[PDB]
From a paper:
We reasoned that the high-affinity NCoR1BBD1 peptide would displace the [name] residues from the [name]-domain β1 strand of the [name]-[name] chimera, whilst still leaving the [name] sequence free to potentially interact with the HP of an adjacent [name] domain; this might result in the effective polymerization of the [name] homodimer. We crystallized the [name]-[name] chimera in the presence of the high-affinity NCoR1BBD1 peptide and solved the structure of the [name]-[name]/NCoR1BBD1 complex to 3.25 Å resolution [Fig. 2(b), Supplementary Fig. S3(a) and Table 1]. The high-affinity NCoR1BBD1 peptide interacted with the lateral groove of the [name] domain, and the N-terminal [name] extension of the [name]-[name] chimera was displaced from the β1 strand as expected. The [name] sequence interacted with the HP region of a neighbouring [name] dimer, and the [name] domains were arranged in distinct filaments that were formed by the back-to-back association of four [name] dimers [Supplementary Figs. S3(a) and S4]. The assembly of [name] dimers into filaments therefore involved two types of association: firstly the end-to-end stacking mediated by α5–α6 and secondly the association of the [name] appendage with the HP region of an adjacent [name] molecule. This latter type of association between adjacent molecules has been described as ‘runaway domain coupling’ when occurring in solution in vivo; the strategy of combining runaway domain coupling with domain stacking leads to a stronger association between units and has been described in the formation of filaments from globular proteins. MAP_CHANNELS analysis revealed solvent channels of diameter ∼50 Å, and we therefore reasoned that we could adapt this system for the accommodation of a guest protein that is expressed as a genetic fusion to the NCoR1BBD1 sequence. Thus, upon crystallization in the presence of the high-affinity NCoR1BBD1 peptide, the two chimeric [name] domains each assembled into filaments that formed open lattices.
Here, we report the functionalization of the [name] (bric à-brac, tramtrack and broad complex) domain from the transcriptional repressor [name] to serve as a promiscuous assembly block that may assist the crystallization of a guest protein. The 129-residue [name] [name] domain forms a symmetrical strand-exchanged homodimer that contains two lateral grooves that bind corepressors with high affinity. We showed that these can mediate the formation of a variety of highly porous lattices, and that a guest protein may be incorporated into a [name]-domain lattice by its genetic fusion to a corepressor peptide that binds to the lateral groove of the [name] domain with high affinity. We have shown that the surface of the [name] [name] domain contains versatile interaction interfaces with the potential to mediate diverse lattices in a range of crystallization conditions.
Residue numbers in the entry:
A (entry chain F): -2 to 126
B (entry chain H), G (entry chain D): 1341 to 1356
C (entry chain E): 6 to 127
D (entry chain G), H (entry chain C): 1340 to 1356
E (entry chain A): -2 to 127
F (entry chain B): -4 to 126
Write the structure that this text describes.
């Protein structure tokens, strides 16, 4: 008898793999491990990973797709950008959770507009209904 | 707190 | 007061992360396996492999761009596990299932090992 | 031919806080 | 009576104009608009405006003013020049921001010597010490 | 501690506050010396050599022309005959100096030329000026 | 020649 | 983090008249 390993071609889909990757990406961020860029927003600094910023922000995609800034390590945003709004959206990029409260939803939305996070803006538009 | 789920796409799709 | 949860966000981030690898964008390490090489992101490799998490946290071994795996590691087995880290999809081919399982032990990916053990039959 | 499985448990180690 | 306008002369100084011009030049550069040169630094390249390069670098001014080298399209720097050092200096030219991270301070400084950017050098010595 | 002559400010960003003004002045010196100028603007009887990049930076009209592939390779631009060569010369100096010089009897010209060149921020500063 | 300062934006912003 | 410094002096060379 043949103890052969199964019929053959097979594929396994790990449903929660995407979530566990992102959670671990945050743990790396929260411990400042392999953070490769510091975002300067109105003299207040935020460290993050360039790849996560590109995946989420259409703006950070445009920025680090460009040769000048692709391999650099500092980005100064428009000084009008609210630092609180950016910090709320950076936590969304890593946790899938958007922590908007009443009073800062207008700042969170207009900052998502600056970062070219198109789908996050629309979810705020419907959240005024 | 109010927790509302969103089943749609959350960020843009980086083209191939 | 409120909070919104985007259920497929993590799935969208991983897809975009694989598109960056696909276009070779901000890849910061090459993994040499026997003859062949594999470019990837150190953050994705640390998120998924207990072994890669171990080097890239070591102080001296943080600023290195070429990792050489042991010559015994099968490139075809590593490539299957690498595509897994970016896609949640582990493709066990006709003749690789033992290699993929073995490489997963080397990479300290204990959960993928445990899943294949429940899968292998004979 | 291309039989697929869904594993819904944890896939990778959990990087500690 | 008369609705005459100003009965004399006056000059309006637009602060942040130069800051706004350079940002738009940076945008034109980021879009490969009217870039007239690529700077090859070892295994790396950079599109740029020869007008911006000449403004900031003694070396690029010395080259692109020469009648013979005026209409050059590709400039290969010395193979010793550090690309990450030059990358920081080209970024500075378009932003007014010189980022000296712990990795490559001496690299940024050395490349600024090579590029005849003596004012940047004198500022690294001014603040960075040992 | 003292045995280690490591470069003291580890990570630092130096903001050269006047670097923008310095770059724009040197662009103007290159203009005055006709160095790497790529276009001549003909305003009625006079001619103005300039750099298209500085023109696109400041003018919405020049940005719109030098933007489609068919027109960014043009050597000679003829402004409309109605455009005052004096009014244009004042605005062109503003592009290279951040200084808009308004002598008596030129302010309406500068304002009208700015509307032509689609420099709407200058135009609005002139509206504030009259009033 | 009375000078006047102007701290507003002087020219349009070229999109990224 | 990154220590920010202003520099009010001339940043580049002055192309002569």
């Amino acid at each position: 008898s043949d103890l052969y390993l199964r019929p053959g071609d097979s594929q396994i889909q790990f449903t929660r793999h995407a979530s566990d990757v992102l959670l671990n990406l945050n743990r790396l961020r929260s411990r400042d491990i392999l953070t490769d860029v510091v975002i300067v927003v109105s003299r207040e600094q935020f460290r993050a990973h360039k790849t996560v910023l590109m995946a989420c922000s259409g703006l950070f995609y445009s920025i680090f797709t460009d040769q000048l800034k692709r391999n650099l390590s500092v980005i100064n945003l428009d000084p009008e950008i609210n630092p609180e709004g950016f910090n709320i959206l950076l936590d969304f990029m890593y946790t899938s959770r958007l922590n908007l409260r009443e009073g800062n939803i207008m700042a969170v939305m207009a900052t998502a507009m600056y970062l070219q996070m198109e789908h996050v803006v629309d979810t705020c538009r419907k959240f005024i209904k | 707190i109010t927790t509302i789920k969103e089943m749609g796409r959350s960020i843009h799709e980086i083209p191939r």
